[PDB]
Amino acid sequence: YEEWKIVKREAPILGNDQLIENIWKMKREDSPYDIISLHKVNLIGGGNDAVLILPGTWSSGEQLVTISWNGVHYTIPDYRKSIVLYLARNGFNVYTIDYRTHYVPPFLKDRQLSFTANWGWSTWISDIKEVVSFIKRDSGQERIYLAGESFGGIAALNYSSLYWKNDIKGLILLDGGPTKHGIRFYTPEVNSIEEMEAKGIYVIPSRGGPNNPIWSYALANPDMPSPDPKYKSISDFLMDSLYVTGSANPYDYPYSKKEDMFPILASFDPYWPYRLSLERDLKFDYEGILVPTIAFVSERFGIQIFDSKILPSNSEIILLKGYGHLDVYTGENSEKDVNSVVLKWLSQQR
Ligand SMILES: [Ca+2]
Ligand SMILES: [Ca+2]
Ligand SMILES: [Ca+2]
Fold first, then answer.
1. 3-state SS assignment for residue 260
2. Shortest CA distance to 123 belongs to which of 206, 52, 34?
3. Record's superkingdom (predicted)?
């Protein structure tokens, strides 16, 4: 349990052979599935500094680097469309974490998932801490840049509220952070910890991931019939389902593409613990965080949901006009609107 063990050493990234990946794994407690992992990406010959990116719900560090799940590949990553690869190409040591969710078998159900009952904030925060400690030694930085996507932005802020003084020198929120008072991709099956155990429902399933091969089928066969007869094709149905949820804008700028969206949905982890959301009770102190911050907010999703008032005083807020949630993370226009802007912001800190 104690140590990080190397599992992939100096491995070139598919479609990006100037970039290399290292992966380490750490056993945690107390079930066989309590494992975390850490990915590092840098240019051949080395990168500098340290940026850690926290994935969002059902996401993983693996997804953030190779748009894959357990080595199952759905596409070839484009560094222009990937914050991790883009920052690594531009000279940074970039790291990203596989949460414990990345080790859950997709076929488990109901009470077989009871080992996730205490996958709450102290667990997640402890796992992020182990990664940060490793990064400091690996990169040589006393403090790091911490980025977060969606849920990962809340995680970044929560982590920072506890450890910013010794660990964090800059925050990058990519459509993620505390949401507004009572802000209403699932309808909750449980509403408390007691109900979770009473009903034996410990996780929220993804509508993508290994248990939903529809996305991958539809990328290869986009003109097949729609399961919902309102639409002319399966791809039409799936892309419009993303539109309706504020996840994509297929119809106007930034012109979300199935080639970008379907691989993301396909490569998610199957399950996410209820415990994190059921600990809405826990108060984190965001008042003292004196860290330079850049926050990106999608017009079609984030502005409606995310609360700007609770962020550090520094914060530069970038509104992404036309964007759905997932457009923040992929697509050819994300290079101009997100990735290059994060790089420029980082250059202003140095
Ligand atoms: Ca140092
Ligand atoms: Ca399916
Ligand atoms: Ca077809």
1. helix
2. 34
3. Archaea
Peptide bond preceding 225: is omega within 30 degrees of 0, i.e. cis?
Answer: no
Helix (H) or strand (E) holding 169, with range, is: strand 168-174
CA of 211 to the centre of ligand 2 (A): 7
Look at phi and psi of residue 175 and say left if phi exceeds 0, alpha if psi is from -120 to 50, else beta.
left
Residues with CB under 5 A from ligand 2 (ion): 212-214
Q: What are the chain's domains?
A: 1-350 (3.40.50.1820)
3-state secondary structure of 7: strand
Structure tokens at 78: 């484009």
**Chain breaks in the chain following residues, C–N > 2.5 Å:** 184
Count of H-run helices and E-run strands, the chain: 12, 13
Resolution (A): 1.9
For 122, the enclosing helix (H) or strand (E) is helix 121-139
What is the C-alpha separation between 205 and 220, in angstroms, rounded?
24
Q: Which two tokens stand for residue 185?
A: 């991709």
For residue 346, what are the contacts with CB-CB under 8 A and spacing of at least 6? 51, 87, 92, 145, 170
Contact 170, 22 (CB under 8 A): no
Is the torsion defined by CA of 135, 139, 144, 146 positive or negative? negative
